[PDB]
Amino acid sequence: VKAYMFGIVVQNPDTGQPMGDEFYNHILERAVGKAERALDISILPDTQHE
Amino acid sequence: LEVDGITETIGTTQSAMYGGASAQILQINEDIKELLDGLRAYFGYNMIGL
Amino acid sequence: LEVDGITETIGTTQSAMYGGASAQILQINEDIKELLDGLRAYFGYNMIGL
Amino acid sequence: FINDRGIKVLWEEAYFCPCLNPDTGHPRVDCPRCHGKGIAYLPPKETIMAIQSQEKGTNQLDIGILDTGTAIGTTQLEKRISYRDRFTVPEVLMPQQ
Amino acid sequence: AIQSQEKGTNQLDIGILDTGTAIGTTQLEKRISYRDRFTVPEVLMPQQMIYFVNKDRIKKGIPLYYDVKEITYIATQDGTVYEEDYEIKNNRLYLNEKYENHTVTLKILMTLRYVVSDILKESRYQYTKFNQPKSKFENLPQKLLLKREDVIVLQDPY
Amino acid sequence: FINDRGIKVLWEEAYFCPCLNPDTGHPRVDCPRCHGKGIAYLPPKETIM
Ligand SMILES: [Zn+2]
Ligand SMILES: [Zn+2]
């Protein structure tokens, strides 16, 4: 992700602390869920019983 | 506000039409619309036989 | 801000209508639209026989 | 607005020192309460003041050099500053020789 | 940054003098002090000189009033003086003894120089907090009044 | 901009005339190279000012 924002930093103006990678991972996992619903597909491997 | 030649001036995101958080709410509504479209594809259309 | 012969004026991309990242988000939405059209051509239209 | 724009200063209030000679009317040069100035000062008070036009005002004289520089100050609300009251600005250091 | 670079010619019974003045804005976080000296190596100023040449000045060399960086014109009653017949060393002018009873006239260039005469804004301040862990005090640019080094003239620092 | 706005002038450069009296320091009033002014002038140069 950060590569696509080369030359930017996301930083709390009251403390100068950069945003933690936990938020990036959380957002990525939800973005994968969104992609798996915009298209009727299963991206990540899983065992299905039908 | 100006005192003794010191000048301070603000234009804020508030306006006679739009509230301070207008833009963020508009973006959130766009995201909600995408999410709802996806989830209303996951759950089906309701139907009943008369 | 004007203080003791130093003056600064800034106009930001924020506005009462648009948030600071409006432009980037719009461009990203265009890219998403192109990608989704392509991927919905790669995977087919869903169909079922009643 | 003033708290944002002003620098922190220590304010101490002037009063005439009671060491003045009852006849000549001049200060005692050895007075410990005032170091030869006629004016004694109360304990310092923390305040914020906005300061402008901070000029050094160098003078070169037959007696030697002297500084007569002048500045303009805007006080906080609800204060009654009095003549020869004294301010110091602990953040700001000036070079001298 | 320098502004209003005035020459300030004066013409007096003692002779000519320059009292010109300029206004300077410093960089951040500097504490310029009275009679601090600046030179501007990029900027060359024209000046003029004349000397009567005598046996002592031939043997000892003429001590020039200005710190000559280079000569643009040199002449005498007999005409132009060619570069084999003069030399400058240590801001002394040496001449061929041919000229033992002549007067030499020069046009010269020298580097611009200033001394701090007075400080018009010795302090400007800002507490900066935005994106800092805690408030940081910073000293903004000073405004200097600069006076030209005519009366006493010193070599360039190198 | 300067070439459009300026008038054409002849510029000639000052230098002290070597006719100055080696004692009194004043110009010779009969000097042909400078007509009693202490200042001689180099040949003129065309410029716009
Ligand atoms: Zn006393
Ligand atoms: Zn002459």
Automatic annotation (TrEMBL), chain A:
Organism of provenance: Staphylococcus phage 812
Protein name: Neck protein
Covered residues, full protein: 52 to 101 of 302
From TrEMBL, chains B, C:
Superkingdom of the source species: Viruses
Protein name: Neck protein
Taxonomic source organism: Staphylococcus phage 812
Residues of the full protein shown: 253 to 302 of 302
From TrEMBL, chain D:
Binding positions for Zn(2+) per the UniProt entry: C17, C19, C31, C34
Protein name as it appears in the record: Capsid protein
Span covered, complete protein: 50 to 146 of 292
UniProtKB/TrEMBL annotation, chain F:
Protein origin, superkingdom: Viruses
Binding site for Zn(2+): C17, C19, C31, C34
Name of the protein: Capsid protein
Organism: Staphylococcus phage 812
Section covered of the full-length record: 50 to 98 of 292
